[PDB]
Write a protein that binds this ligand. Sequence first.
Ligand SMILES: *[C@@H]1O[C@H](CO)[C@@H](O[C@@H]2O[C@H](CO)[C@@H](O[C@@H]3O[C@H](CO)[C@@H](O)[C@H](O[C@H]4O[C@H](CO)[C@@H](O)[C@H](O)[C@@H]4O[C@H]4O[C@H](CO)[C@@H](O)[C@H](O)[C@@H]4O)[C@@H]3O)[C@H](O)[C@H]2NC(C)=O)[C@H](O)[C@H]1NC(C)=O
Ligand SMILES: *[C@@H]1O[C@H](CO)[C@@H](O[C@@H]2O[C@H](CO)[C@@H](O)[C@H](O)[C@H]2NC(C)=O)[C@H](O)[C@H]1NC(C)=O
Ligand SMILES: *[C@@H]1O[C@H](CO)[C@@H](O[C@@H]2O[C@H](CO)[C@@H](O)[C@H](O)[C@H]2NC(C)=O)[C@H](O)[C@H]1NC(C)=O
Ligand SMILES: *[C@@H]1O[C@H](CO)[C@@H](O[C@@H]2O[C@H](CO)[C@@H](O)[C@H](O)[C@H]2NC(C)=O)[C@H](O)[C@H]1NC(C)=O
Ligand SMILES: *[C@@H]1O[C@H](CO)[C@@H](O[C@@H]2O[C@H](CO)[C@@H](O)[C@H](O)[C@H]2NC(C)=O)[C@H](O)[C@H]1NC(C)=O
Ligand SMILES: *[C@@H]1O[C@H](CO)[C@@H](O[C@@H]2O[C@H](CO)[C@@H](O)[C@H](O)[C@H]2NC(C)=O)[C@H](O)[C@H]1NC(C)=O
Ligand SMILES: *[C@@H]1O[C@H](CO)[C@@H](O[C@@H]2O[C@H](CO)[C@@H](O)[C@H](O)[C@H]2NC(C)=O)[C@H](O)[C@H]1NC(C)=O
Ligand SMILES: *[C@@H]1O[C@H](CO)[C@@H](O[C@@H]2O[C@H](CO)[C@@H](O)[C@H](O)[C@H]2NC(C)=O)[C@H](O)[C@H]1NC(C)=O
Ligand SMILES: *[C@@H]1O[C@H](CO)[C@@H](O[C@@H]2O[C@H](CO)[C@@H](O)[C@H](O)[C@H]2NC(C)=O)[C@H](O)[C@H]1NC(C)=O
Ligand SMILES: *[C@@H]1O[C@H](CO)[C@@H](O)[C@H](O)[C@H]1NC(C)=O
Ligand SMILES: *[C@@H]1O[C@H](CO)[C@@H](O)[C@H](O)[C@H]1NC(C)=O
Ligand SMILES: *[C@@H]1O[C@H](CO)[C@@H](O)[C@H](O)[C@H]1NC(C)=O
Ligand SMILES: *[C@@H]1O[C@H](CO)[C@@H](O)[C@H](O)[C@H]1NC(C)=O
Ligand SMILES: *[C@@H]1O[C@H](CO)[C@@H](O)[C@H](O)[C@H]1NC(C)=O
Ligand SMILES: *[C@@H]1O[C@H](CO)[C@@H](O)[C@H](O)[C@H]1NC(C)=O
Ligand SMILES: *[C@@H]1O[C@H](CO)[C@@H](O)[C@H](O)[C@H]1NC(C)=O
Lengths: 110, 48, 441, 130, 130, 125, 125, 125
Amino acid sequence: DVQMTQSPSSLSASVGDRVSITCRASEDITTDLEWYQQKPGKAPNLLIYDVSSLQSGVPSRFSGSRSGTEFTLTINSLQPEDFATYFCLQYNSYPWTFGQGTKVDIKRTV
Amino acid sequence: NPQEIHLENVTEEFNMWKNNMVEQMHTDIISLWDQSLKPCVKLTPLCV
Amino acid sequence: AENLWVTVYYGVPVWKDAETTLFCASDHNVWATHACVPTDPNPQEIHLENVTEEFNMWKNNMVEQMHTDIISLWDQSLKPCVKLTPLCVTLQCTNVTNNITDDMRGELKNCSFNMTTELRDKKQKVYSLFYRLDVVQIKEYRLINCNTSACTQACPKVSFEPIPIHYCAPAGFAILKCKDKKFNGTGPCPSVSTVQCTHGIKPVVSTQLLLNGSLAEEEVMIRSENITNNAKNILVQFNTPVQINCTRPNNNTRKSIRIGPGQAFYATGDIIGDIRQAHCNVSKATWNETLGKVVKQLRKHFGNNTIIRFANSSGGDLEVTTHSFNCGGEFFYCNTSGLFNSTWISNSNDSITLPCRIKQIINMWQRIGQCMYAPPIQGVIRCVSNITGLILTRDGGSTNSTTETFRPGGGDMRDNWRSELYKYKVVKIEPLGVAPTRCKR
Amino acid sequence: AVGIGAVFLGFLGAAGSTMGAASMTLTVQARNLLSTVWGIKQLQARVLAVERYLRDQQLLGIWGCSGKLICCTNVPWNSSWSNRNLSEIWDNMTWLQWDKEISNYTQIIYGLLEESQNQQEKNEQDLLAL
Amino acid sequence: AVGIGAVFLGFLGAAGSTMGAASMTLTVQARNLLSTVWGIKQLQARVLAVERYLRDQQLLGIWGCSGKLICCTNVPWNSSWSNRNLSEIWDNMTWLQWDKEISNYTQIIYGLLEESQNQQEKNEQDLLAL
Amino acid sequence: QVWLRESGPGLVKSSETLSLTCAVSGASVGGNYYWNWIRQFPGKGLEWMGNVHGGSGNTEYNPSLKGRLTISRDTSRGHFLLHLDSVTAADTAVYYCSTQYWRHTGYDSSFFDSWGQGALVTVSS
Amino acid sequence: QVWLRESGPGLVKSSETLSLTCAVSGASVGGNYYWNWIRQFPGKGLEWMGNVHGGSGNTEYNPSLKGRLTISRDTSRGHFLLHLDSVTAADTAVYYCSTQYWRHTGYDSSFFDSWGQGALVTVSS
Amino acid sequence: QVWLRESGPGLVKSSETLSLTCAVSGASVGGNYYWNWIRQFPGKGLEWMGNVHGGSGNTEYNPSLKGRLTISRDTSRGHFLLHLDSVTAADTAVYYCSTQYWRHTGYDSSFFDSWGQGALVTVSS
Ligand SMILES: *[C@@H]1O[C@H](CO)[C@@H](O[C@@H]2O[C@H](CO)[C@@H](O[C@@H]3O[C@H](CO)[C@@H](O)[C@H](O[C@H]4O[C@H](CO)[C@@H](O)[C@H](O)[C@@H]4O[C@H]4O[C@H](CO)[C@@H](O)[C@H](O)[C@@H]4O)[C@@H]3O)[C@H](O)[C@H]2NC(C)=O)[C@H](O)[C@H]1NC(C)=O
Ligand SMILES: *[C@@H]1O[C@H](CO)[C@@H](O[C@@H]2O[C@H](CO)[C@@H](O)[C@H](O)[C@H]2NC(C)=O)[C@H](O)[C@H]1NC(C)=O
Ligand SMILES: *[C@@H]1O[C@H](CO)[C@@H](O[C@@H]2O[C@H](CO)[C@@H](O)[C@H](O)[C@H]2NC(C)=O)[C@H](O)[C@H]1NC(C)=O
Ligand SMILES: *[C@@H]1O[C@H](CO)[C@@H](O[C@@H]2O[C@H](CO)[C@@H](O)[C@H](O)[C@H]2NC(C)=O)[C@H](O)[C@H]1NC(C)=O
Ligand SMILES: *[C@@H]1O[C@H](CO)[C@@H](O[C@@H]2O[C@H](CO)[C@@H](O)[C@H](O)[C@H]2NC(C)=O)[C@H](O)[C@H]1NC(C)=O
Ligand SMILES: *[C@@H]1O[C@H](CO)[C@@H](O[C@@H]2O[C@H](CO)[C@@H](O)[C@H](O)[C@H]2NC(C)=O)[C@H](O)[C@H]1NC(C)=O
Ligand SMILES: *[C@@H]1O[C@H](CO)[C@@H](O[C@@H]2O[C@H](CO)[C@@H](O)[C@H](O)[C@H]2NC(C)=O)[C@H](O)[C@H]1NC(C)=O
Ligand SMILES: *[C@@H]1O[C@H](CO)[C@@H](O[C@@H]2O[C@H](CO)[C@@H](O)[C@H](O)[C@H]2NC(C)=O)[C@H](O)[C@H]1NC(C)=O
Ligand SMILES: *[C@@H]1O[C@H](CO)[C@@H](O[C@@H]2O[C@H](CO)[C@@H](O)[C@H](O)[C@H]2NC(C)=O)[C@H](O)[C@H]1NC(C)=O
Ligand SMILES: *[C@@H]1O[C@H](CO)[C@@H](O)[C@H](O)[C@H]1NC(C)=O
Ligand SMILES: *[C@@H]1O[C@H](CO)[C@@H](O)[C@H](O)[C@H]1NC(C)=O
Ligand SMILES: *[C@@H]1O[C@H](CO)[C@@H](O)[C@H](O)[C@H]1NC(C)=O
Ligand SMILES: *[C@@H]1O[C@H](CO)[C@@H](O)[C@H](O)[C@H]1NC(C)=O
Ligand SMILES: *[C@@H]1O[C@H](CO)[C@@H](O)[C@H](O)[C@H]1NC(C)=O
Ligand SMILES: *[C@@H]1O[C@H](CO)[C@@H](O)[C@H](O)[C@H]1NC(C)=O
Ligand SMILES: *[C@@H]1O[C@H](CO)[C@@H](O)[C@H](O)[C@H]1NC(C)=O
């Protein structure tokens, strides 16, 4: 089974900051990777497919990049609605495997 | 013996001033008139 | 074990190469659009993904069909027009020598003759102006075509302006179009689509240069059936056009002479003002840049260290030796000698002027015994056009020399159609198929 | 690469897909099969289009598959015509390739289908006689 | 005005009767659908008559009602198309009025019929596979 | 011409169910026809019992005979049946099956009426 | 748009067989679609369980769930069912049914994704 | 070419029913063919027993064997069967199934005759 490894496990960012989350695979998967977003108490929603192709209705601030076996989701300007858990899904070969999930929290005054 | 079938309890809409059969009849009459005159003498020498 | 049985499928997407007859579709003219079906406002194109086809522009059957239809329409349009049989009479001609420059000395003839009238027992004496290319000495001259055949006068209401034409296939057939750029008209094409009707193609007639054509989307494209052979013409397609401005500045006058009952002949009355030759202008820097692109592309096929020569035409008839076209209803023949004159070695507002002649008796297609008389046009005429390709031919080519000489060509008009229908082919569907399956009726 | 759906609604959109995927859009191809210098060409085109549809329908009806798009019969699959498995045909190959490979042995199958249909009709009539 | 029988054997004799009464004389209408200045007109007329009949037959055969004059199908009657009851349709209306009323929603039913027939054919093949 | 023939038992005991069969020849029962059942009592006037439409199948009955009269069709056998429950001595009568219809043959329309010979039914214990 | 709705019992005793249903609206189960069953454990990441192809019927299961997981289709009823045998306390999770597919509408192409709201299943005696 | 193969038990007890089968390959039993059953006794001449027509099904039997000989066809299985009741010791013989027919293909007509290898049947208690 191809193993997804997400980093960081959890992060805190403020509104308008730039955030980057990495997903690594045990082997090459070419382009068949997707980035999903899941808010609390809600089913996952597709954000990006085919590494760097944006789903219709997804704001353009989100972006995806690849480097070798590593992939990166980048949010240029985080928004209040962007706080959620992000997952990387690989479907190049069976079985489909998910990442450990990265939770983005709100950074505010104590 | 032509056959004619009356339609009971049927009312139709009619308009003589927009009939297309008149144009077809005119075109066929003109075409036949032109065709009938093709094999006939041409009076070109008569212009003297 | 296998226990497999035959199963029949109807509607299978399979096609085969075939030859059929396409019909016309378009949105008074010689290229009659009256009997052409209207074109749909929004044509449908279906892209096929993961379909690799085989294409060959040098064996397309659509070119022959287009040539035949163009010739048939041209012949049909001339049927109801005046026949200039009485015009074959002895003419008494003199030179015109008023307000003429040095380069138009003896190029026009003032010819008087006797002509018939509406009454068949009366005669009239008339005069006209003729071009030196239309009269041959028998102080007595006669029209060149008198000893070959008499031909009709073009009706003055039908226009020679090209109109786009769409070619559509019948039901059960389909047209495949190659969308792959950099495709040289032969071999596999990986990007394919299916279309119902071909885009608008203007039947522009010209030699030595392609006018009002289509431009390559990436770079200058060079095509040839067999580039190693010198007997095959080379088709060049520019990625950008070159503007050319042609003009006849003489102020002509047209006068009608009644030669019979309901039959008129349109002669050239007189020229008002100065008499000067027609000519064409083309920019210099743009032509130099285009030739640089062309020689750069040619170096790919003919080596990176060869010397490329552009020279004059060899010889022959005026139709194949000069850039012949039709502007504003007048038939121009221009001397394209200042363009293809240079040598390239591996390592501002001025313009080139091409002098042109005008002809009235025309043998449009390469036929014998069917000419055509173009009535004169009133007033000066000017036109502007694009140049979007060339027809070249390699002179010699033996291994005894390390130089390549290219000269303009033409003659056959099929090559004018071949530059537009190079990315199209026609196939016929075969929906029936048989497969193995675990059924049992 | 595996686990992705593909649906086509074009005229020949499924031409590049596998046989199994392409066998789900037969109707769209079925619809289109029927529908002075230019008029004669139009008339000839119409007649030519009409003739081939009738020929195809006659051939379909002679085998007993009239009015059907996916009709299967009693004639067994002779192993001499092909030797591949169903897994490597319906999920690996395309209709164009299959036709290119099988074009050699079509008339034999057609004749066998005709004879089998005639025999089945005779047997059905004999059964209904009782 | 009630308890009277009406029977029509003409070409379009039942045009003025109710839908239920008119649905008993479909064959008489079915028979007629097929059958230098004037010869070309005759030829064009013949070609057009053939083309329209072939189009109608193809459309009927695609839905699975081939070789039938009355054929009900699996597609449910959407209430948005009409709201009247069967008593007020088959005994209180004529075919012309019904066609005038329903002409807005014709193509959707055709597409649904085609899709349903294709699905039924696929299901039949799957069942016969076992 | 449409021919109608009545048939059934000649005697029915009181309180039983009277069954009658009218057979049609020369026409289809499933056509656009109306088939009517009418009884005439001895030495009295006529009385229309009911009728049925061959095509749709709607049945119409006299209010007096409602709740005990049932008229049904049979297209395969080409005849129609009548059932009358709780027959009493007053139900003795001659029963007839009849039909009326307009025939519109092309240019000409004609009214046709057909009756059967009738069957005598006597109700008594 | 393809709509997917999950359904099934909310509680399953240990060692029993968990049965779940996913109903599809707006599309045919027999089409060229892939239907995938996934689960999310409480306070943990997602885990794809299996999937089935509507047309051919081939099913692909996770190796961990192999030997106890079954996925079946139903074109007539237009829904697909999932069975998991020998469910234990570790199998408590929220189950989802999803589908991904490319739609090639002539000239245009578009990737479509669909998920269901999901159903919570708790395993305990 | 039409191939015929005989089959059946090698021994039949006296007074029992002898059953024989002849299978046809290369031709349809339901065609316009005549299938003939013949036998040869040991050290004696031939003796035609009977025959059947594949299409109509009419059977013609020897008068000596009438009342005990039956010949039947099977189009689905493509073979024809023979039954002889009350077989005695005199019925021991080699049985053959044969067929003769004219084949008129286009311009040319030919006569074809086919025989089987035959099966030896011995009758004794
Ligand atoms: C490549 O394409 C370019 C443009 O895309 C072409 O250049 C165009 O050419 C057309 C045709 O010559 C030209 O349109 C003419 O413009 C003239 C000036 O305005 C008009 O006078 C002329 O109309 C006359 O001719 C028509 C027939 O062509 C008649 O129908 C019309 O009634 C006019 O004729 C009247 O006047 C004459 C003279 O008085 C008289 O004898 C007649 O009896 C009648 O009374 C056309 O409309 C465009 O203007 C050109 N475009 C540009 C930008 O200049 C070019 O020709 C193409 N190249 C090739 C090789 O074909
Ligand atoms: C062409 O020749 C004709 C005839 O010689 C010229 O017409 C004559 O012109 C002169 C000078 O204007 C007049 O005096 C005559 O009366 C004209 N003759 C007729 C019959 O009209 C005409 O001018 C010449 N044209 C050119 C361009 O040289
Ligand atoms: C037009 O016709 C007239 C009459 O035929 C020609 O004039 C004659 O020419 C001939 C030939 O030289 C002379 O022999 C006659 O004497 C002339 N007759 C007259 C009355 O002049 C005239 O030359 C013809 N015009 C042209 C241009 O050919
Ligand atoms: C392209 O043209 C060359 C030149 O003619 C062809 O090569 C010639 O082929 C003929 C055929 O037998 C020979 O006789 C010549 O000797 C060849 N000449 C040279 C220089 O090779 C070549 O075959 C053509 N290409 C194709 C595809 O036909
Ligand atoms: C082609 O170019 C020449 C110049 O080489 C032009 O000639 C000039 O034309 C203008 C017209 O406005 C005159 O005013 C000038 O006097 C001309 N100069 C010369 C030296 O002749 C010519 O007009 C151009 N023609 C076209 C059709 O573009
Ligand atoms: C051909 O003619 C066009 C216009 O008829 C010329 O375009 C002009 O180009 C000059 C540049 O020298 C500009 O100042 C003008 O504004 C342009 N006019 C228009 C209407 O666009 C073109 O230059 C001519 N080409 C040649 C080679 O003479
Ligand atoms: C191309 O240029 C050459 C020379 O530059 C032309 O040859 C000339 O042709 C004319 C016409 O017959 C002769 O009068 C000259 O004597 C020739 N010059 C030489 C040096 O031989 C040739 O005609 C030009 N091509 C075209 C098609 O005109
Ligand atoms: C086309 O143009 C060229 C260039 O002017 C012509 O060649 C000239 O021809 C004349 C003949 O009168 C000679 O005097 C010149 O010496 C030639 N020029 C050169 C550079 O050699 C050519 O003749 C023209 N084409 C035609 C058919 O005349
Ligand atoms: C000559 O070429 C130019 C540029 O390729 C043409 O100008 C274009 O015309 C099309 C008409 O469909 C426009 O959509 C483009 O915007 C034009 N381009 C520019 C830069 O303006 C011109 O039409 C061509 N001439 C002829 C006669 O076709
Ligand atoms: C005649 O037709 C009208 C409507 O077209 C209908 O209302 C009327 O009942 C019909 N007449 C008879 C006698 O049925
Ligand atoms: C495209 O077609 C080729 C050959 O049929 C096949 O190998 C390839 O897998 C196809 N592309 C995709 C994305 O499946
Ligand atoms: C007309 O001019 C040409 C050219 O100058 C000359 O050859 C010819 O002889 C002249 N003809 C005359 C003056 O008749
Ligand atoms: C007509 O005359 C010209 C020049 O005199 C000549 O070249 C041509 O060959 C002649 N036509 C024929 C058919 O001989
Ligand atoms: C260019 O033409 C040559 C002709 O031999 C052909 O082999 C080649 O494939 C063509 N180029 C492309 C990109 O197809
Ligand atoms: C040509 O001559 C006519 C008549 O005098 C005049 O009206 C016209 O303006 C002239 N043409 C030009 C371009 O001046
Ligand atoms: C041809 O080019 C040469 C320069 O190489 C030049 O001297 C000559 O004038 C040119 N000829 C023409 C006709 O322009």
